[PDB]
Write a protein that binds this DNA or RNA. Structure first.
Lengths: 59, 65, 186
RNA sequence: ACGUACGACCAUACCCAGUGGAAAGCACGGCAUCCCGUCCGCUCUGCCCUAGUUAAGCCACUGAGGGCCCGGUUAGUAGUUGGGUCGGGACCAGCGAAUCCCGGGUGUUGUACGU
RNA sequence: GUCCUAAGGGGGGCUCAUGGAGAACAGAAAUCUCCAGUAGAACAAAAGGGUAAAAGUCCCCUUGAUUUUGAUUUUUGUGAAUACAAACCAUGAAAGUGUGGCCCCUUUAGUCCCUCGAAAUUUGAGGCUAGAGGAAGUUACCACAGGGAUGGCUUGUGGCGGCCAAGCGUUCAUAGCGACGUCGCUUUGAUCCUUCGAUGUCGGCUCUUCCUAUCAUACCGAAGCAGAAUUCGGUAAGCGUUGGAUUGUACCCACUAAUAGGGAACGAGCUGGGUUUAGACCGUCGUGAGACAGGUUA
RNA sequence: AUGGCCAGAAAGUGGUGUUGACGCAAUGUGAUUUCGCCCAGUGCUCUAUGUCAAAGUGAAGAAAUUCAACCAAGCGCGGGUAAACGGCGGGAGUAACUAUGACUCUCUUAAGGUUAACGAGAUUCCCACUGUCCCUAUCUACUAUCUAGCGAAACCACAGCCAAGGGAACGGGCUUGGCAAAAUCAGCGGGGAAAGA
RNA sequence: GACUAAUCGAACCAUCUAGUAGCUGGUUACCGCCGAAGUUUCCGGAUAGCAGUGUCGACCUUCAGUUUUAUGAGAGCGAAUGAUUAGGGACUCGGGGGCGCCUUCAUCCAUUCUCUGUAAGAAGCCCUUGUUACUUAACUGAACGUGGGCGAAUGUCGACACUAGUGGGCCAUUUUUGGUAAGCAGAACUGGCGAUGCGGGAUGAACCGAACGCGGGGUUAAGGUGCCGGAGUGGACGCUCAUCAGACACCACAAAAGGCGUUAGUACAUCUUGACAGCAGGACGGUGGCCAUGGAAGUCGGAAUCCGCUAAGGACUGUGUAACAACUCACCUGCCGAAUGUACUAGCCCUGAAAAUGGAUGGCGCUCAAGCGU
RNA sequence: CGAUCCUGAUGUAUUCGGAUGGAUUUGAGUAGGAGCGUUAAGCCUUGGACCCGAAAGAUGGUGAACUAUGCUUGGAUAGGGU
């Protein structure tokens, strides 16, 4: 069925929040004895040509 | 959608397991259920994590998670 | 109420805070530290006082008779080699090893007797009350071997500090009562 | 034929602009005592038919007006009913539209009383 | 547990939603005035049908939102609705309109209701009438009565999305399909530190024949094919196409001219796995008999 | 022992028992060496209110009857028990009907420096050994074969050459072709037939 | 779960007992006369429909799977939504931090974006006349009677009783609704089959013709007439030669497909001012155009691509050189002699994909057919 | 005419009686009887029920000459190695 919510952004995040989240999560990967709680509910998707140039300039 | 997976050692098998024959997205941080308790089997070879998504106005195709 | 729409409209509730938007992304997370509870295998970096305390703890808390016997033997060997090598002290050593009189392990009881015999007599003397109370308990205890080994402990105490035993409060009449109760001479 | 009253079909009658209206009939009009109703005699109701005026209503005419209505065509076309040992849609026997376009119009009529 | 499941009748007067133009504060929005306004308002269906001197709104009186009997529709009894028939009314000057809202057990009562069957009374019961309320699994130890066991398909060249375009259509609409192509997603000769799920079963021995979709031998065409060794392709099935290793479960090695691919089974010859009667053990599940994610033995 | 576990329709009945805890009875584990915690749930077991049968008691009525207390065991409440079945942590903070959970904080541990002998048990390998194989050959006896005598059974709609077609992917009879010559013997296992199928 | 007399997850013997089965198998002479059926509707069953025997009633009324004429009807979504909030405020205890005071987030608000029925008569029509408690100002109307007068074509029964079988089968045309890569899945009417023989499709459940007592004569349908095979190597006009043509095609392969196969047409163009093809010659100058290159002169590359002499000739179509040269093409002239060229369209033909025992327009065979169209 | 509902007449064991009227359905009812016995056929129900066929259930008896275990009484089993 047609709906307005198909054509809207479903997940949004700001610059500072994304940068702080990435820095904190990288600091968490620095320690191998520290593991996340409820990792399935965390936005982990955000965390996770010389040959072409030469061929373009000289075929 | 589902095919019947037969289990047991007798000639008369049990047929409660269903295997998904179409591609699936199992989700993030997915660990398979114990074999005694999984009914719906989603094989590893049919799991996709990226798709070739085309932007309609930009007319470009990119591989997105 | 059985209808299942593709998108569910959130319902505003009065007197409650507004819900966060559907596109909101939460970056807060909590972490728990995994720790492996296993001691060092070589046990060589620790100081001799730390080995003394650890072996005393093993002697008083171990569930293996051979382990308790070896720990008491190690403590007895260090006390015999040097009485100055007692970081815990005579009072603490006595307080920890006096409940082991009632122990069912005869080898542990004999090694405890050796530890008592290698304790310094002038430090044994002021604390004759507690030792004699443990002797009374483990001596009226039901097991005959425990009674015999506790009598050996009482023999050691009478050899080392006789006057303190016969002059401490309850050292005379209560000991006589325990003797008469065990002998049937009541 | 023209008015008035009650009407039948209910836009060929409606809406927007102008122009004219013999005779009478309409209508606007004049006055608030009585009957009557209002914030207000605006509407309604009562009294006058004298005066004034066709200004408006109404009637008639006009408009390459909007709309509406009626014909030709479209078209024996689309479509549809049966037939073939017809082809890989066409014939046979028949029924049979509406658009688009081309034009026309812009009310008939009964009863009764009058001019 | 509280709350909502809707006020009908008669008569009379007036038009609604909205738009334009105006009035101290007053403006986008307070009240007032004119013009336009076919319902774009309202009527208890949010885009169904129907209503403009009303079926809407306001005012004045009123409860036809009343008894009684048949008929009809939805179709034995219902219930709802529809025209009435009789009585009692309401409203209006009157015509008229109004009979609603626009469309099987338990238990109670019966004076004059009837029985308890030899007669009567009192309790109780029964009847009739009128109401109110609301019984699990397993069988791999087995047995019986029966019934069964897509095809003139297929092959060599991806999908999605966008351009280009011969053409097909198309001139009272100038839309739509579209071959050939092209463009985006699916390591500077690397890495060897990414093997991604048996429900479906194949093999082997012996032996014969067929097909060509030709690996080799015969012949031929082309390629910087000097020679040698080849590569690509064509005609051709005459003639050959091997010996082994590995079951903690199909690829390696060697010889050779070459170690080509299939059919006749996979739409009652013999022999190893899928594979599984009865004995037994371990793992998972179940209180259990037992079953299985399974593994092993005879 | 006026007992435990069992038999019997019953019995002045019987087994253990001509027995007495170094015994009888019920179980689990299964030589020897080596080898914690929890009574949460389910069992088993020990000790005044609730639940509370029959008999008995009291009240009402003319009685049938109705209503009341009282009310054993069991269940419930409270303890024990894990070489019972099972299961694999604890405490504090927060909170304060009942049960729950959630949330932090902190300890988080029984086990480290005899596998022999025997076996028609299952598996891998090495030496020896060989017709298992390259790759088959030869010999003997008894059959099979022929003769004299004797002599069944299974099975049997009717019969037995194929090719193509015969919509119900069946054909030995139908259609169209190939064709096709008495009567026989030894083998053979393609087909038909044949498995207490 | 072994043994208990070849019998064991409850032995053997007799009886109840001819236990029960909806399941399996079978169910016995002939002729004659009728003769079927599959959601039609309701909650695994009833029921409509279709059939046969007896009757009875005036087997009276006539009706009809037909035509003609006249006239009518024709559930969900929602600017009541989905977003945006950087810049502006109110903020203050909303929360929290630091030192009652400030704050850092955060709270919101202010902003904005998104509209198929009926009729076609003798029971009908007309006149007169009554009855009424109905109705009307009124015998003014309403029905029902009294008396009298007078209709389209074509073809030619009803009610019971009893008893069945079948009542959610298959196939086909047409229509309608959904889809799929393609298949396909639903409904409605009609026809057929199950129940059915005959002639033709070589053969056959669904095709065509036609339905059936026992015979004789005649004529045909569908299909055929070279032989098997009864009937024409019949007649006319053409087309086609296939290295397994074609003679039963429509579906797939499969396309706007590929053919220097062969016919018939359509459109455009050239032509005695000489068409197409050939033969003999010209095919030039600025200029070796500009840039680049070791070299590049039309012909390794990039970009432009003009003018003159012209009858005509490209800043060049290929061969060629290291570069030139040279040859050639486009184009022009001379010889010649009359019709051609391009692209489509319609026929027939070839290819347009095939496995595995030896075989099929039915078989032989057929070539101005014994193939194809009339 | 019988059942159901409404009214309640003359009368009176003054609390019995139910006339006169109405209104609905109802009943194979009345409204100038049609039945009884019997014969033959079709159909239905119950019986073994058209015939043959279960694994079965129950009642009462017979078996330890096979075999399982136990009691009583008997019999038998070279030569080597350690």
């Amino acid at each position: 069925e047609p709906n307005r919510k198909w054509f809207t952004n479903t997940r949004v995040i700001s610059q500072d929040t994304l940068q702080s989240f990435r820095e904190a999560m990288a600091e968490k990967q620095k320690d191998p004895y520290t593991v996340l709680l409820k990792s399935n509910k965390l936005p982990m998707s955000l965390i996770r040509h010389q040959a072409k140039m030469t061929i373009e300039r000289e075929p | 959608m589902f095919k019947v997976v037969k289990t047991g050692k007798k000639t008369h098998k049990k047929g409660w397991k269903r295997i998904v024959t179409k591609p699936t997205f199992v989700g993030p941080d997915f660990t398979r259920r114990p074999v005694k308790y999984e009914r719906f089997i989603r094989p590893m070879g049919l799991r996709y994590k990226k798709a070739n998504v085309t932007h309609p106005t930009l007319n470009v195709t990119v591989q997105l998670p | 109420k059985e209808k299942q729409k593709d998108f569910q409209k959130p319902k505003l509730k009065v007197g409650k805070p507004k819900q966060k938007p559907s596109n909101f992304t939460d970056t807060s997370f909590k972490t728990k530290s995994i720790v492996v509870n296993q001691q060092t295998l070589t046990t060589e970096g620790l100081d001799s006082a730390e080995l003394f305390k650890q072996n005393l703890t093993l002697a008083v808390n171990a569930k293996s008779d051979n382990q308790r016997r070896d720990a008491l033997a190690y403590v007895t060997n260090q006390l015999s080699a040097n009485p100055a090598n007692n970081p815990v002290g005579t009072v603490g050593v006595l307080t920890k090893v006096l409940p082991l009189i009632t122990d069912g392990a005869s080898s542990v009881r004999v090694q405890l007797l050796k530890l008592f015999r290698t304790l310094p007599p002038q430090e044994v003397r002021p604390h004759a009350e507690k030792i004699l109370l443990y002797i009374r308990g483990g001596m009226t205890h039901l097991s005959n071997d425990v009674r015999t080994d506790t009598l050996n402990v009482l023999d050691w105490l009478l050899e080392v500090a006789g006057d303190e035993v016969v002059s401490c409060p309850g050292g005379w009449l209560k000991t006589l009562n325990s003797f008469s109760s065990m002998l049937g001479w009541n």
